[PDB]
Amino acid sequence: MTYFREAVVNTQELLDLLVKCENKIQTRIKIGLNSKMPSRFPPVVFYTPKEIGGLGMLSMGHVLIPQSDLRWMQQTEAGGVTHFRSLIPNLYRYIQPWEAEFVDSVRVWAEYALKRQEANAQNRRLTLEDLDDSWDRGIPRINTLFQKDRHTLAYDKGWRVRTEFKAYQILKQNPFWWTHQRHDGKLWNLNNYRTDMIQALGGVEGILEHTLFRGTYFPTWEGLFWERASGFEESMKFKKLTNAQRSGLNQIPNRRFTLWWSPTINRANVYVGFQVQLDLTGIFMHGKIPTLKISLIQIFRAHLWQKIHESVVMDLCQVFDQELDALEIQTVQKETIHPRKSYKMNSSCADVLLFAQYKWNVSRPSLMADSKDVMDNTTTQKYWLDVQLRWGDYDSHDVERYARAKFLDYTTDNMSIYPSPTGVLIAIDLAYNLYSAYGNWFPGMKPLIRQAMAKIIKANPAFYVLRERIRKGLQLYSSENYGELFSNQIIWFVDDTNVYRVTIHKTFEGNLTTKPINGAIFIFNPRTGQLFLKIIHTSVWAGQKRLSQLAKWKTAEEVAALIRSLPVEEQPRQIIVTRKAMLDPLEVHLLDFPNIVIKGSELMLPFQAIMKVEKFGDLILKATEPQMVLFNLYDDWLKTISSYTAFSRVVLIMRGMHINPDKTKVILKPDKTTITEPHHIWPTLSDDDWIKVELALKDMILADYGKKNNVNVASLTQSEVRDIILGMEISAPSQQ
Amino acid sequence: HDTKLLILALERLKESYSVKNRLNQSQREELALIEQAYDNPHEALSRIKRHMLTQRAFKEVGIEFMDLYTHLIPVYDIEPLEKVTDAYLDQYLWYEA
Amino acid sequence: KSVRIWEWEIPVDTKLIQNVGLHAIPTMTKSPNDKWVVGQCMDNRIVLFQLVDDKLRFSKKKAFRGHNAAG
Amino acid sequence: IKGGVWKNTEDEILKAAIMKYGKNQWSRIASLLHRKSAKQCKARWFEWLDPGIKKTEWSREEDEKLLHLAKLMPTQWRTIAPIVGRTSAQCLERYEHLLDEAQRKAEGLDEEATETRKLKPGEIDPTPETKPARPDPIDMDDDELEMLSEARARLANTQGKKAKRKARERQLSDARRLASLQKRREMR
Amino acid sequence: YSNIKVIDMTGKQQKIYSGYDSFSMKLIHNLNLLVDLTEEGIRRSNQQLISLKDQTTA
Amino acid sequence: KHLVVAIGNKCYAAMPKGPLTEDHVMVLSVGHIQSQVSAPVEVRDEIEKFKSAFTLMANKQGKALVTFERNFRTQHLQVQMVMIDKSSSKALKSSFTTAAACAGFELVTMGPDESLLDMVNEGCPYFVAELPDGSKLFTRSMKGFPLHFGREVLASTPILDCEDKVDWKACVLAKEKEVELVNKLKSDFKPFDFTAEDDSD
Amino acid sequence: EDEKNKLSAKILKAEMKGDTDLVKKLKRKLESMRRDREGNILPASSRRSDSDRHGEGSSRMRREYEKSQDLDSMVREEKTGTAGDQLRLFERSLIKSSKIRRHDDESVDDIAEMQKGKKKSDEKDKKRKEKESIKEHKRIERSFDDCSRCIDSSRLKKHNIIAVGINTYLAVVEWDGLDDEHLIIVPTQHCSSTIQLDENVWDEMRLWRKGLVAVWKSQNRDCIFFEMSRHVDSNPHVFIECVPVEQEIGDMASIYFKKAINECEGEYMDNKKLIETKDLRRQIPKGFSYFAVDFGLSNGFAHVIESHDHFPSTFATEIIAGMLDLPPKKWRKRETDEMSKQKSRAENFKKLWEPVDWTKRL
Ligand SMILES: [Mg+2]
Ligand SMILES: [Zn+2]
């Protein structure tokens, strides 16, 4: 198309050939996937190309798209599920004809000579603006001046005939035999074709969501990158040189691609075929899509389909175990989890049975999307819940309609068993993480399931196991709470920056030499005000030169030992870290625990100011052993201010003291007669005197921040004081 | 000019293997000679000049055909230590010509 | 064609004696003093081992073949 | 790595390898010679080591024919080599030596013979197949002896995989015959 | 491990313990906890009100 | 034990079994220490004090003091101290750099007090030689390093001209002569010995 | 212990003074590891029981599929195990499947269910995986011990250094670099990319950059800051090179790298072939090799490496040498002329660096 681009359109017997060849290539992929009909094959697989897809077919065929296929579906916070609705290009339009290139190249090289001839008299440095403007123009392009080789390339004179003679030197046929593109700087640009190809799909939201990505469901696209296909596709398969046997294997490299597309490719729309179920699993597999079966066997490996079903049921039970009173449930019963209930698809039994002593009215049968119900249609009290798991395909991730249809079928099918007529069915699509409920609701139930189910989805670690196995099979990796701290739970902050520390002093060389020093681990609970402070003198620093990596392990090991020894009743529910690389050594030690969760704080924390607490640490440095010291950071503050203000105050005062620390020596004594008493950590100031220094410190933080920000007042006073009270890293206007 | 002509020669030879990637012995001997020719570059020119003056009789050429279904093409693999001399000479002849 | 020394109540192979010179031993007799143990080889050979040496590379310090047996 | 001068053991392993496998297996022959492998074995045999390679002095008519043909051909030396059958290297070094012989003849005879053309300037040589055959030294030991030992074994082997393996199955069936016979003898 | 030193500065006077064993074995609370509880009720309701009004206009 | 010359605090000075000269003394640590980089500061400080003390003793004799340390295939910290003529002191730099180039490594030149601790961390084998002017010669290339390289350089013809003494085992003197040299060393060092009056505490 | 060396030594020391009662007094003083995709280093774990949990029934892959374990062990598994451990389950099942005659009606992964092998193969693979874990550990520890960049290194070249911060240091290159003032910023302790630096060391690396721009701006130069981080799969130590250029080159440099990065690898590699840099710690995932280049304080360009054979390890030095018309020896060789060359260079820059108060306020 680059060489022939003027001629090819008139050559239309060649256009018939190009349609034939493009169709042949597609047929070869269809055969490799094993198929004998178009119907399971939407175009989208090929054209989705590098960015998402992994293939990347450029087209010259008038492939009329299925576009009635182009519908994508999303779940709202209400549990209601919303639907969204929308010819792929020939290159020929994008590839500029040679007439255009020859006229455009004459004028662009002419105007460069004028601009350079101007620039030679003007001796002024040549503009960046024109060089960014003219980039794709000239037969020797203008970017050829950028080429970096060009000081040598000036001496390469044979090169166009020489590239033709390479056909005698080298056994591989070269399509670009005519263009040494470092001289020809590059006579085409695909980027408009790729971007329009996404538009012709409606790609970015629509096609991503469509395939497997809803199974990964984590955020949008922007974080996500594809790793190398590490696994059996590469390392031994290359090493052994078996190639007679590798011809027998030859589907296996397709495995990464086939898994991602398989929600499309598996889809039941064969024109002709029959449906088979993968054992111990609810997946229906249509034809022998070659690699997919082992890929799914490796994802599901062990019972996990059953294990997901029982875990969400018992998490539902645990909600009802708490919501006994507000629902008038005298007990919640867990029915027998028959070991095939979760993947027998013809029938179901209730899983959770609720008991009551109440007079009660219940809705006719209704969806989570119905925000109010005919809740007086009937009076009854006995309730069942039933949970159905699903693995959707692009023809059907229907879960609103599937929840409706399966509820009606199983309640009416005599093969089913149910304890009462008043029931909800819960449906979850493991291929898409969509959920739906269809139910005879009593009034309280619908908002509870709505709230619980959303929180359940993330929490329910059996889904985490499934997702992480999908991510690993995909090799696809991503680059990436303020009310919770007060709210109720046992939550800790932890530090590692003060643990391993080194001091610098100059040798008689006049260059700098290092000496290492004792360091502290800072652990803090914001709701109780309680601080634990573990000192590391001897044990780590004597032992190794690894000490930084060992110090991370020892930080996680010492905090693990603290949690393990001190309670079983009041072990932290959450631990919060800014150092988030610190999450990973904690996580392995939490594997002894399971019951504890770690979060990455998303907000900046005092711990650099704890280096100023290291001044009080110097009183610790006087101690000779790796002792532990216990503190509460709240004095008289502990009663009155402690929940609401004192976290905000301590965050503000502690962060402020770091950039202020000499100035804080003055400000801590707002009047010279004021004092800090030995039984307190903070100055003896009342309410209003604490407010005066608090407001001064807050404004002084904003004043120093204002010195960069100096356009500060109008936006940053309203928005950024909130965000600085949170502690966001606010650097946004250039980053936006 | 010679040091710059040698760069153009060596980078032409290396370009074929950057595409081809798989190296038996002879591609390993050639890439060793090309990488050597960079750190040698004044020495490598001295060999190339000495080769062009003295040697006059050469190691055997291998021949292979390239299968385009309407017509074969004949492909020759000259010995690597000579190819750098031929490759410098090709660049030099065309530059002076 | 190996001699394996195993511990009481323990199923795993604590010590493995393995050499090509090891062979099927149909009869083994231990001295009552525990000083020596005798082994008969099917190719009309007798080889002596020390019960405490465990020199797992195997050895033939003293061997005899004067018997006219046929295994 | 490949190349450099040819020892004795490499020529003699080359001859011996040429005896069992040789006249065009040479990739297989290189398996016995490290460091001299595919192309260099063939080039050593045909240029230097072939019988009939006529390593003797250049007579009158051979020198006549070589100068006659150098005037007739220009530089065609691979074609010239069959006619004089003294091959390509032998022609070229003789021809260049005869060109030296004329200019040197009076004035060079003592000094120009000696003060330039006496040796290469320490440089590495592309010829070494054609020039020599070094003796193996008085204490040749472990480089030569390793390949000498590999050569002797590979010259002896004479058997396929199946014959070597089924010979063990004959031995192992004989061993099972002894064990199973004796159990029959004693349990009967 | 039982001999690992703890110092306690949480009370008005310092104490030293054989920390891990002893600390593992180791009216006004309701008045304190209730005023924090009620104010958190107020603030959470207040933030819900602000966010709901913005969402309502959206 | 008869070969010990002087015995300060962290370190003691002793004559080797095979001395290059009559004034060759070595300073070793009484605790089992691999090198000066592993040695505490007080051990290294006394080594620098011995260097100063022996230089003053050498200065009375009209000699310069040369020191070097070899941390390679050793388990006990040993510092060698050899006294040479002032003329040979200038030759040291050319002798060391020539011997290093012949051995196949580079000596790096450091100023009046730099290399000993600062260039490398504990556990690294290293050789260091300090010249009488205070500059240090240091190298990290210890693979195949000659164990007697420091003795070999000092024993060369322009310095001491005692190439036979390079191998310490051959030059070993009789026990009666060894006691004489140690007693002579003790007497000459005794006026300069500043440690003899630190004992009051 | 070492104080015993003083008193053991002081015995003769009193006798050198010859006060026999001092002799008595000093005598009476004595004579009375694994990697993860995030690029952490974490404690190892071993599959000691996983050979025995399987049901001893059907063919191999069915046993692995049926074996049963609770969500506890599955959460532990999924947090410890890399994707390699999941994908390696292909091997023994399908390697033997390659020999078997296939029909399009029932085939590739069907035959993979049918293959047998049992405990002798599991023991050999179990021992293999254990040996590979030890090899991984030894490889990791070698990457710490052969690291010349850590201040704890045995291979350190400390005379390179011109300034040291709390967590980072600034030094002259070890070679005939592109300029006498060719400098590097290095983290004092080991990490394999700047993205893997957490907030204090990340921000401290940026802090040097304001000083260096100001120092070279006083010369009317511009400067290029770039990271080559091929290291990330293997754990070598990152540094940012700080190369000064003439202002006329600085104005062009963003053009040169913008072009070259679009050409560094084949056209059909998977990810985006160029990243514009704004929030780099969130734009490129941890554990990916990448290149990034910044021009003065302006955030520049990055690329995520996918073919370490194709993307050249010298990339930016070739480009900047191509802006400076230098001969290839200035970037191909890394000719390590050091002894006097670095000392004069380090001291000369140090004399130029000292006005930057960040050097002194610490
Ligand atoms: Mg076969
Ligand atoms: Zn490092």
Curated annotation (Swiss-Prot), chain A:
From the UniProt entry, list the residue stretches annotated as the region RNase H homology domain. Answer: 481-734
From the UniProt entry, list the residue stretches annotated as the region Restriction endonuclease homology domain. Answer: 304-475
Ranges for region Linker: 34-300
Q: Which residues form the signal peptide?
A: none
Quick one: where's region Important for branch point selection?
236-249
Annotated compartments: Nucleus
Subunit text: Part of the U5 snRNP complex and of the U4/U6-U5 tri-snRNP complex.
The domain section of the record reads:
The MPN (JAB/Mov34) domain has structural similarity with deubiquitinating enzymes, but lacks the residues that would bind the catalytic metal ion.
Q: What does this protein do?
A: Functions as a scaffold that mediates the ordered assembly of spliceosomal proteins and snRNAs. Required for the assembly of the U4/U6-U5 tri-snRNP complex. Functions as a scaffold that positions spliceosomal U2, U5 and U6 snRNAs at splice sites on pre-mRNA substrates, so that splicing can occur. Interacts with both the 5' and the 3' splice site.
Specify the protein name.
Pre-mRNA-splicing factor 8 homolog
Its source organism is Caenorhabditis elegans
Lineage here is: Eukaryota, Metazoa, Ecdysozoa, Nematoda, Chromadorea
Curated annotation (Swiss-Prot), chain E:
In which tissues is this gene expressed?
Answer: Detected in muscle cells from body, pharynx and vulva, in neurons from head and tail, in pharyngeal gland and in tail hypodermal cells.
The source's domain of life comes to Eukaryota
Known function: May be involved in pre-mRNA splicing. Required for embryonic development and survival.
The organism named in the record is Caenorhabditis elegans
User: Localized where?
Assistant: Nucleus
- Whole-protein residues included: 279 to 356 of 830
What is the protein name stated in its UniProt record?
Answer: Septin and tuftelin-interacting protein 1 homolog
Signal peptide coordinates: none
Q: Which family does it belong to?
A: Belongs to the TFP11/STIP family.
Q: How does it assemble?
A: Identified in the spliceosome C complex. Can assemble into large rod-like polymers.
From Swiss-Prot, chain F:
Provide the family line.
Belongs to the CWF19 family.
Q: What is this protein called?
A: CWF19-like protein 1 homolog
Question: What species does this protein belong to?
Answer: Caenorhabditis elegans
Higher taxonomy: Eukaryota, Metazoa, Ecdysozoa, Nematoda, Chromadorea
Which residues of the intact protein are shown? 333 to 533 of 533
Swiss-Prot record, chain G:
What are the disulfide bonds? none
Keyword Hydrolase carried by entry: no
List the GO biological process terms.
mRNA splicing, via spliceosome
Q: Which residues form a coiled coil?
A: 10-32, 118-139
Under the cellular component aspect of Gene Ontology, which terms does the record hold? post-mRNA release spliceosomal complex
- The segment annotated Disordered runs over 29-83, 101-135
Q: Where is the composition biased (Basic and acidic residues)?
A: 47-80, 113-135
Keywords from the named record: Coiled coil
Origin, by domain of life?
Eukaryota
Membership in a protein family = Belongs to the CWF19 family.
The protein, known as: CWF19-like protein 2 homolog
Give the organism the record lists: Caenorhabditis elegans
Q: Quote the gene name from the UniProt entry.
A: cwf-19L2
The stretch of the full-length protein covered here is 75 to 454 of 460
